[PDB]
Paper text:
Given the specific and apparently strong LPS-FusA interactions indicated by the CG-MD simulations, Ra-LPS and Re-LPS from K12 E. coli were doped into the LDAO micelles of FusA at a 10:1 LPS:protein ratio. The Ra-LPS dataset, for which about twice as many images were obtained (∼8 000 micrographs vs ∼ 4000 micrographs), finally resolved to a global resolution of 2.8 Å with the core of the structure extending to ∼ 2.2 Å, and the Re-LPS data to ∼ 7.9 Å. The structure of the protein, especially in the plug and transmembrane barrel region, is very similar to the previously solved crystal structure (average RMSD: 1.2 Å). Consistent with these conclusions, non-protein density was observed at a variety of sites around the reconstruction, both in the micelle and interacting with the protein surface. LPS was conservatively assigned if density could be observed for both its acyl chains and adjacent extra-micellar density that could belong to the polysaccharide chain. While extra density, attributable to LPS sugars, was observed binding to the extracellular loops of the protein (glucose sugars in density shown for reference only), the regions of density were disconnected, indicative of stronger binding sites for specific LPS sugars on the protein surface anchoring a more weakly associated polysaccharide in place. However, the assigned LPS density did appear to cluster into four specific regions which were labelled according to the likely interacting β-strands at the membrane interface (β11-13, β14-16, β17-19, β21-β1). In addition, a cluster of acyl chains, without corresponding extra-micellar density, was observed at β2-5. Despite the addition of LPS being required for successful structure determination, no major structural modulation is observed in FusA around the LPS binding sites in comparison to the apo crystal structure.
Residue numbers in the entry: 59 to 867
């Protein structure tokens, strides 16, 4: 029932469109590659990493990728704690690799698959006052719902593998890649994508759906000095149990359980017993009550959500031993974690278990009053409220002792090492730790309430629809009262839907980033020392490490302006919209002094202009022929995005640095956005169904502006006597970092996806499915790294086959 002016600002992708579009894993974000206002993070598709199951990071209209409202069934699917870690780049020491890491499951708590979703509502603009806690878009993943009559269901298996995935990889990383010695170089992998679904009446007005998904990847990893092969394993399970009782009153009570635990078994390079699992996601249970009174509709909701981004290492202490060195060699330590010729250190163990968890109880109530007429205008008064009572908690579960500095008595002194009988930091007759670093059991806790309320009029007269709304909201984290005007108009110009304009002016406010609260003492470690392996641990010496703190902050916001036209040219709807976002008060990092101690502190010093012109052409109805039905959607956009070099909430304000860019001297906040910001796209989905064969051949051909990779100078250009760029400021005596461009060619993306259904008997079908991503196998550049001395280019995947089978009744 969404109104005209807002419907041109949303894209609705139902189960049929999801079955049809060419698909990789089919994360909720991969489905967004048919929205012309979505930019993916440069690395999110990459030949280096075809084993990854995680959501591809998405910017809507140049806003921060962690500032979208990802939703599942109309409830938040967002990480309020650490959503944007490492700018969404695949950091080689995953979060958890070190004892002071605040874990990060990306911006989404639950990683739902395309299998589990019955509609995706992708709101890029003109977004209703119903939706908030974003500066970005909204992606409302309506998961599969009970059917009261069908008794139906599905089982599927989908798979891809290294031998089915052509790799385009740069020569400067090829031997490291094919060695398998790096967590995010994946030359060998297997993916298995299991699912089940049952959709059954308990009684004729009381359906339930049970659904299971199991995205799995196995990925061999090689420790080059420990000389071991270990599988990394990536798993996203999702269990969903949705029930719906349609009462005799016509009011629907819906019970919605979910458990979406995703895990990633990483390892620490050459560390013995060195494995760790970044677990994440968690569970839900909601009750929703859709009441359908004489006034209209009242969708009441209560629900619990739990999220637990957790690292668990395979040990809860960490030791550095020494195999050999000048004047010493050992018989106990039987591995190496280094390659040196004069001496070698050998590492064992890990940093125990630590987690950051949200426990959020949500109340909501959405009202949709029937159209009431006043002063000749019809008013559809939508209104509502929600309250998230939440506790966020980062917490280590056991004291992690770590092995500090090792003393290794040489020659005739070696026999002096006699350990205390319980000691983890001594080896008898070999060596002992002189210092021990305790990362203690800790609990940082923040209990908060976020209130929000809205009114959303949607009101019509004389061919207009005008949809004024507001969305007041208050988080007791920052204590900000945010008032968020939303305006979205439309006019059917020529008496009919064939020619109709629209536009809007909306302020969007984002959710909390609790990372600086959860870190308030992360890296607090107590050092202790001992003179001999029999002596006591003498002197607890706390270092609080890199401290973090909360500060008085405005909420990050995005001022949208939008305008557009929808036109019915000769059997096709052409919808064109411009959208401009002034992302403002966006978070960055600062250092400040409190009670004489230095703290890292969040600031509002970031901003992002993002600008799009987007075009969306589709037919009025599918074409039909003797052979086929053929259906298509030509999306396109031209885009321009900007940033301070405050890339995310941990980035410092490098805005004031001098750089040489576009062949002139300028401040670093005047660079074009390095991530996101491919200039343009033009994608044609065409879908074909051959009734003579039951074969569907669904294909996406998409031309896009080639990546413009920038590499830094290793030495800063002394402006005075260093570059013609210096004419940009002849007063500058200092040095500038130069950026050198490489403009890779504008490229044809081409993905196929076939699916043939075979009736097993009258009620049931077995479907064979075959994606072929990059059917051309073309080399496409997608990121570029480092200085001009080490230009590591990264590419989008080669030809990748995904076979699938789906039995259904």
């Amino acid at each position: 029932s969404t109104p005209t002016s807002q419907s041109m600002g949303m894209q609705i992708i139902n189960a049929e469109q999801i079955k049809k579009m060419p698909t990789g894993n089919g994360s909720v974000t991969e489905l967004l590659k048919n929205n012309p206002n979505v930019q993916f993070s440069n690395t999110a598709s990459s030949s280096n990493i075809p084993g990854e199951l995680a959501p591809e990071n998405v910017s809507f209209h140049g806003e921060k990728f962690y500032n979208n409202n990802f939703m599942v069934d109309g409830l938040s699917n967002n990480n309020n704690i650490n959503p944007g870690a490492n700018n969404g780049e695949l950091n080689q020491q995953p979060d958890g690799y070190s004892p002071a890491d605040l874990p990060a499951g990306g911006p989404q708590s639950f990683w739902i698959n395309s299998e589990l979703i019955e509609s995706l509502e992708v709101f890029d603009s003109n977004i209703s006052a119903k939706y908030g806690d974003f500066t970005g878009g909204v992606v409302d993943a309506k998961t599969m719902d009970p059917k009261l009559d069908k008794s139906s269901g599905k089982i599927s298996y989908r798979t891809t593998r290294d031998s089915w995935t052509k790799y385009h990889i740069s020569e400067v990383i090829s031997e490291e890649f094919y060695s398998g010695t790096n967590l995010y170089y994946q030359p060998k992998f297997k993916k298995h994508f299991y699912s089940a679904t049952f959709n059954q009446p308990l009684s004729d007005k009381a359906g339930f759906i049970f659904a299971y998904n199991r995205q799995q990847s196995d990925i061999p990893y090689y420790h080059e000095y420990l000389q071991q092969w270990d599988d990394q394993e990536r798993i996203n399970e999702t269990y969903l149990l949705k029930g719906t009782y349609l009462t005799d009153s016509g009011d629907i009570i819906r019970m919605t359980g979910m458990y979406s635990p995703h895990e990633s078994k990483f390892y620490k390079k050459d560390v013995k017993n060195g494995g760790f699992t970044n677990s994440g996601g968690g569970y839900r249970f909601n009750m929703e009550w859709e009441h359908n009174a004489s006034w209209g509709k009242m969708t009441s909701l209560a629900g619990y959500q739990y999220t637990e981004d957790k690292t668990e290492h395979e040990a809860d202490s960490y030791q550095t031993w020494r195999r050999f060195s000048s004047g010493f060699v050992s018989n106990v330590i039987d591995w190496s974690s280094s390659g040196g010729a004069n001496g070698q250190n050998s590492n064992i163990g890990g940093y125990g278990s630590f987690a950051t968890n949200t426990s959020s109880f949500s109340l909501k109530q959405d009202y949709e009053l029937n159209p009431v007429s006043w002063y000749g205008i019809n008013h559809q008064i939508d209104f509502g409220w929600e309250t998230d009572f939440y506790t966020s908690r980062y917490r280590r579960f056991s004291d992690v002792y770590t092995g500090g500095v090792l003393v290794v008595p040489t020659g005739a002194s070696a026999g002096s090492v006699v350990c205390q009988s319980g000691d983890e930091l001594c080896i008898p007759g070999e060596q002992y730790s002189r210092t021990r670093i305790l990362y203690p059991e800790r609990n940082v806790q923040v209990s908060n309430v976020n209130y929000a309320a809205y009114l959303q009029n949607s009101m019509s007269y004389g061919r207009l629809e005008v949809t004024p709304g507001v969305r007041v909201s208050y988080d007791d984290f920052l204590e900000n009262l945010n008032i968020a005007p939303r305006f979205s108009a439309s006019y059917d110009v020529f008496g009919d839907r064939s020619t109709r304009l629209f536009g809007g002016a909306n302020r969007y406010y984002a959710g909390n980033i609790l990372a600086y609260k959860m870190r308030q003492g992360i890296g607090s470690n107590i050092q202790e020392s001992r003179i001999s392996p029999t002596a006591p641990w003498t002197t607890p010496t706390l270092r609080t490490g890199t401290n973090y703190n909360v500060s008085d902050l405005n909420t990050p916001y995005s001022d949208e302006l939008s305008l557009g036209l929808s036109q019915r040219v000769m059997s096709t709807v052409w919808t064109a919209k411009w959208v401009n976002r002034q992302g403002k008060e966006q978070f960055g990092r600062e250092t400040t002094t409190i009670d004489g101690q230095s703290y890292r502190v969040m600031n509002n010093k970031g901003h992002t202009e993002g600008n799009t012109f987007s075009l969306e052409v589709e037919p009025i109805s599918p074409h039909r022929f003797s052979f086929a039905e053929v259906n298509w959607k030509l999306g396109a956009s031209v885009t321009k995005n900007k940033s301070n070099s405050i890339y995310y909430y941990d980035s410092a304000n490098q805005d004031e640095q001098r750089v040489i860019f576009d062949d002139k001297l300028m401040y670093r906040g005047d660079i074009d956005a390095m991530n996101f910001n491919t200039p343009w796209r033009a994608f044609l989905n065409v879908n074909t169904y051959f009734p003579a064969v039951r074969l569907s051949w669904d294909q996406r051909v998409g031309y896009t502006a080639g990546y413009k990779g920038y590499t830094t100078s290793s030495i800063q250009v002394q402006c005075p006597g260093g570059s013609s760029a210096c004419n940009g400021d002849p007063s500058f005596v200092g040095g500038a970092t130069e950026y050198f461009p490489t403009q890779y060619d504008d490229f044809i993306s081409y993905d196929w996806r076939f699916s043939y259904s075979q009736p097993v008997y009258k009620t049931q079908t077995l479907d064979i499915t075959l994606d072929v991503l990059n059917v051309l196998d073309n080399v496409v550049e997608t990121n570029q790294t480092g200085t001009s001395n080490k230009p590591i280019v990264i590419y989008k995947p080669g030809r990748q086959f995904w076979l699938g089978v789906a039995y259904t009744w």
